Amino acid sequence: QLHQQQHQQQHQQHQQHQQQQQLHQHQQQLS
Amino acid sequence: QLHQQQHQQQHQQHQQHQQQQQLHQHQQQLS
Amino acid sequence: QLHQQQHQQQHQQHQQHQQQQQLHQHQQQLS
Amino acid sequence: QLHQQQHQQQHQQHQQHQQQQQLHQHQQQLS
Amino acid sequence: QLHQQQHQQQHQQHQQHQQQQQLHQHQQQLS
Amino acid sequence: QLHQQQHQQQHQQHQQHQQQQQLHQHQQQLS
Amino acid sequence: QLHQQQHQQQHQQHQQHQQQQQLHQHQQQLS
Amino acid sequence: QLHQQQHQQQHQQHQQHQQQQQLHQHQQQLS
Amino acid sequence: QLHQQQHQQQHQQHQQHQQQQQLHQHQQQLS
Question: Where is composition skewed (Low complexity) in this entry (chains A, B, C, D, E, F, G, H, I)?
Answer without folding.
Answer: 1-30
